[PDB]
Amino acid sequence: EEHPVGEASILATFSVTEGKKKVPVAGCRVQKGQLEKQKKFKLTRNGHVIWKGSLTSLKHHKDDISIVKTGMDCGLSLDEDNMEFQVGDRIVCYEEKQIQAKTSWDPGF
RNA sequence: ACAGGUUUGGUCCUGGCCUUUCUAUUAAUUCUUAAUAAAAUUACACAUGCAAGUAUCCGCGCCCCGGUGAGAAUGCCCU
RNA sequence: CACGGGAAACAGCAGUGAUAAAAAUUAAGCCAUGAACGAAAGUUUGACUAAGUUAUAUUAAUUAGAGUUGGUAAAUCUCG
RNA sequence: AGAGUUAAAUUAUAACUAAGCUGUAAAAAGCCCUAGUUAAAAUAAAAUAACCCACGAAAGUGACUCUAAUAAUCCUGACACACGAUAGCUAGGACCCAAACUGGGAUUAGAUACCCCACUAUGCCUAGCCCUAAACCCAAAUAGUUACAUAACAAAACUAUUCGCCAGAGUACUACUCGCAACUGCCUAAAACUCAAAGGACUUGGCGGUGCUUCACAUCCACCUAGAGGAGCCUGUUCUAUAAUCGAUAAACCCCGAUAGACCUUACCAACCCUUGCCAAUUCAGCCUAUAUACCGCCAUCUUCAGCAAACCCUAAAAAG
RNA sequence: UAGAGUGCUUGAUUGAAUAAGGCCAUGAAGCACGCACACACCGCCCGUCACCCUCCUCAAGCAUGUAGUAAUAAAAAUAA
RNA sequence: AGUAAGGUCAGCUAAAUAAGCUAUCGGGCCCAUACCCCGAAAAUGUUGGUUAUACCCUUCCCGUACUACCA
RNA sequence: AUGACCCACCAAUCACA
Numbered sequence: 001e002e003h004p005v006g007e008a009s010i011l012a013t014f015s016v017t018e019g020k021k022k023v024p025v026a027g028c029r030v031q032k033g034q035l036e037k038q039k040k041f042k043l044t045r046n047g048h049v050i051w052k053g054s055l056t057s058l059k060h061h062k063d064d065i066s067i068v069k070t071g072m073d074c075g076l077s078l079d080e081d082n083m084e085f086q087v088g089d090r091i092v093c094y095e096e097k098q099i100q101a102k103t104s105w106d107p108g109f
Numbered sequence: 110a111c112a113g114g115u116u117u118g119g120u121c122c123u124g125g126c127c128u129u130u131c132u133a134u135u136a137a138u139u140c141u142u143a144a145u146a147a148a149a150u151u152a153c154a155c156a157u158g159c160a161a162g163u164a165u166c167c168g169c170g171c172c173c174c175g176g177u178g179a180g181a182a183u184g185c186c187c188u
Numbered sequence: 189c190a191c192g193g194g195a196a197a198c199a200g201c202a203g204u205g206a207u208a209a210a211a212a213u214u215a216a217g218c219c220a221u222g223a224a225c226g227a228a229a230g231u232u233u234g235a236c237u238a239a240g241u242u243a244u245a246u247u248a249a250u251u252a253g254a255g256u257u258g259g260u261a262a263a264u265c266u267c268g
Numbered sequence: 269a270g271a272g273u274u275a276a277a278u279u280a281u282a283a284c285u286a287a288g289c290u291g292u293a294a295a296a297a298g299c300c301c302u303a304g305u306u307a308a309a310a311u312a313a314a315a316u317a318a319c320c321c322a323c324g325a326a327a328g329u330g331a332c333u334c335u336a337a338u339a340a341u342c343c344u345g346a347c348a349c350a351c352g353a354u355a356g357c358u359a360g361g362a363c364c365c366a367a368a369c370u371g372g373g374a375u376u377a378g379a380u381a382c383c384c385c386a387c388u389a390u391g392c393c394u395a396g397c398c399c400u401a402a403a404c405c406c407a408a409a410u411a412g413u414u415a416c417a418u419a420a421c422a423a424a425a426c427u428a429u430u431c432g433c434c435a436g437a438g439u440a441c442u443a444c445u446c447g448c449a450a451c452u453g454c455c456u457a458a459a460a461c462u463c464a465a466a467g468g469a470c471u472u473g474g475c476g477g478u479g480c481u482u483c484a485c486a487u488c489c490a491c492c493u494a495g496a497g498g499a500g501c502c503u504g505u506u507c508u509a510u511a512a513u514c515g516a517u518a519a520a521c522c523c524c525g526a527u528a529g530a531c532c533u534u535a536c537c538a539a540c541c542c543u544u545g546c547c548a549a550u551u552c553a554g555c556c557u558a559u560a561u562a563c564c565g566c567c568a569u570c571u572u573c574a575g576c577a578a579a580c581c582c583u584a585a586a587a588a589g
Numbered sequence: 590u591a592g593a594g595u596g597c598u599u600g601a602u603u604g605a606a607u608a609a610g611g612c613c614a615u616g617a618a619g620c621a622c623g624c625a626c627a628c629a630c631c632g633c634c635c636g637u638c639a640c641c642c643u644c645c646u647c648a649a650g651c652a653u654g655u656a657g658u659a660a661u662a663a664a665a666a667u668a669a
Numbered sequence: 670a671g672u673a674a675g676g677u678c679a680g681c682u683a684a685a686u687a688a689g690c691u692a693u694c695g696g697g698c699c700c701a702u703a704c705c706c707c708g709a710a711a712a713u714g715u716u717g718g719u720u721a722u723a724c725c726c727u728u729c730c731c732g733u734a735c736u737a738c739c740a
Numbered sequence: 741a742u743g744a745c746c747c748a749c750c751a752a753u754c755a756c757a
């Protein structure tokens with residue numbers, strides 16, 4: 001079961017040069033909830049879902065921070081280079097909890 | 110072995126594999142009756158019954174027969 | 189090896205679990221041979237004798253089915 | 269094995285002279301502190317003789333001189349002993365010239381090659397290792413014979429005494445062991461598994477960017493003439509296109525089946541129609557349906573190529589010639 | 590062919606140039622030589638890589654099973 | 670962000686007749702593919718200005734080596 | 741420079757009574 005953790009809207013897109021590699025950076029503002037580094041993420045464009053996966057780098061003001069709270073600005077670089085970050089995109093951080101099912105079989109007796 | 114098939118476009122040589130014979134176990138398919146012979150997966154575990162007594166007391170018999178091939182290169186033959 | 193120790197013994201005849209491709213009777217007699225004991229008549233003996241079971245093999249007849257038919261290697265026709 | 273020596277080259281290095289020298293099928297790069305001549309140590313390597321066939325156990329040894337020297341009254345014999353080409357390793361010395369590597373230059377689709385230039389390890393000396401070669405004259409040592417006698421090819425066939433080896437092919441000069449100055453090593457040397465062959469020699473073809481001869485007569489080069497390939501048309505292919513045939517489709521198709529399509533032709537497409545439906549008869553006519561890889565008929569092609577083939581005969585065996 | 594070609598098949602007219610060489614590249618013949626080819630060079634064939642599968646080996650380690658020698662004492666006696 | 674060279678065709682390059690090598694398509698060669706040999710199309714980045722010329726200067730884009738700095 | 745795989749020789753007549 002996928003239950004939601006946090007949601008953040010992108011604002012500005014940056015190109016940062018580290019180790020001779022241009023890294024697209026999504027500047028984000030966390031609206032409702034929080035974002036955590038280990039959780040799974042999905043990107044949302046005007047109601048569509050563009051991407052599924054985990055960040056490469058979540059970095060906030062020259063510090064790498066595992067958990068950004070609400071109202072916190074956070075830089076986000078994905079591992080997927082094919083992903084395009086626009087000015088108005090939405091981002092949903094979700095966590096997966098495990099539901100343990102019992103037998104669908106009930107013996108008559 | 111009285112031999113035969115098979116290397117190659119072909120021939121010779123060399124060289125393996127296989128066929129043909131005979132027996133035993135198992136299996137498949139078939140199966141009428143006798144006789145004789147033989148009876149065999151297992152040194153894994155065993156319900157029950159029987160397998161050692163005789164005899165005027167002592168005594169004498171009681172893995173001898175029977176079982177098995179576990180172990181051991183054990184050993185054969187011979188002093 | 190067997191003082192000891194694991195532990196509670198069919199590798200006697202039958203049987204039975206397990207196991208394996210592997211499947212004989214939980215049978216009758218001491219009448220004959222052998223063995224034990226007895227001075228002896230005799231008793232005992234799943235040794236054994238006579239039977240039961242089984243195409244495992246031979247033989248005898250009452251029994252016909254299996255395999256094979258391109259070559260080696262006996263033997264074929266029409267369909268699919 | 270020692271010690272000593274050096275003729276021909278080559279080079280450091282000067283002296284003149286010249287602007288180039290080097291280098292290839294052809295260039296480039298390199299060098300001009302280069303080249304030619306005249307002078308020259310060291311180092312390394314040993315024309316001719318050798319058309320000889322000697323020495324050594326083998327590996328090996330062919331400039332000159334001297335010293336020392338080539339086991340056994342001579343059968344075979346190891347895993348024991350002592351040696352063992354090149355490469356390679358360690359340490360010290362040498363360095364003319366050659367040269368793995370590497371760097372440049374060409375070449376090429378690429379070229380981590382062949383070709384060009386530079387230069388190194390290394391080739392040399394001393395000392396120690398290493399122990400391998402197509403270490404193959406693929407033919408064991410020692411005595412013999414030339415009798416019997418052809419698988420093939422090759423270097424003719426064999427006896428006796430020995431020793432060493434070999435039991436399909438791969439897997440495999442591999443994996444594991446033991447030993448070894450070897451540590452990417454040598455030696456010794458399996459099995460699972462896979463296959464139904466793997467090998468040896470020959471035969472006739474075909475082929476060969478193999479060599480030597482001889483040619484080409486519209487024929488390859490050399491050469492002559494007129495054209496094609498560019499334009500417009502004509503006509504055929506291929507595609508694409510259509511509801512809308514088929515066949516040819518390297519040489520050996522492409523104004524080809526057609527010396528011939530407006531209807532017909534005609535096989536195609538679309539609508540419609542007809543079911544003993546060309547004929548003397550026939551549970552029969554009819555089919556331009558499939559197969560040209562079942563065929564006959566006609567041909568193309570090698571080809572203006574010279575061979576094919578029956579019947580025989582010959583060959584210490586014959587596939588064939 | 591009724592008609593349909595710049596096509597085809599035939600007849601005729603005017604009417605040249607060059608070749609007297611070459612074996613280096615192409616091709617042909619003969620002879621040598623080679624062949625791992627024989628569907629016969631449009632032949633055959635080698636290794637990586639890629640896709641699966643089989644089997645051996647080597648593995649830090651882990652399970653289960655597996656046992657030794659050393660000197661002794663023991664031949665001495667009591668009571669009847 | 671600054672700096673310096675720069676921008677000629679899809680890629681690199683020459684010059685000022687707008688061209689040559691690869692890429693691309695199309696022909697040819699070959700029994701056939703590939704190499705190879707030809708042919709075609711392919712533009713001086715958009716703004717502005719001139720002149721006997723644009724390879725002069727500017728605007729707005731651009732990129733690149735170099736520095737700084739970027740979540 | 742290159743050019744899937746696969747291709748081949750293992751059966752006997754006619755005629756007469």
Ligand SMILES: *C(=O)[C@H](CCSC)NC=O
Pocket residue numbers: 011012013026027028059060061062072073074075740
């Ligand atoms: C990064 O540092 C962040 C910038 C994103 S806002 C566009 N601000 C704070 O963490």
Ligand SMILES: [Mg+2]
Pocket residue numbers: 116
């Ligand atoms: Mg063979």
Ligand SMILES: [Mg+2]
Pocket residue numbers: none
């Ligand atoms: Mg054959």
Ligand SMILES: [Mg+2]
Pocket residue numbers: none
């Ligand atoms: Mg044989």
Ligand SMILES: [Mg+2]
Pocket residue numbers: none
């Ligand atoms: Mg049975």
Ligand SMILES: [Mg+2]
Pocket residue numbers: none
């Ligand atoms: Mg016994």
Ligand SMILES: [Mg+2]
Pocket residue numbers: none
């Ligand atoms: Mg033993």
Ligand SMILES: [Mg+2]
Pocket residue numbers: none
């Ligand atoms: Mg015991």
Ligand SMILES: [Mg+2]
Pocket residue numbers: 198
């Ligand atoms: Mg029993």
Ligand SMILES: [Mg+2]
Pocket residue numbers: none
């Ligand atoms: Mg007992």
Ligand SMILES: [Mg+2]
Pocket residue numbers: none
């Ligand atoms: Mg049972």
Ligand SMILES: [Mg+2]
Pocket residue numbers: 149210
């Ligand atoms: Mg049985």
Ligand SMILES: [Mg+2]
Pocket residue numbers: 211
């Ligand atoms: Mg039964």
Ligand SMILES: [Mg+2]
Pocket residue numbers: 218
């Ligand atoms: Mg009795």
Ligand SMILES: [Mg+2]
Pocket residue numbers: none
């Ligand atoms: Mg009695």
Ligand SMILES: [Mg+2]
Pocket residue numbers: none
């Ligand atoms: Mg009884």
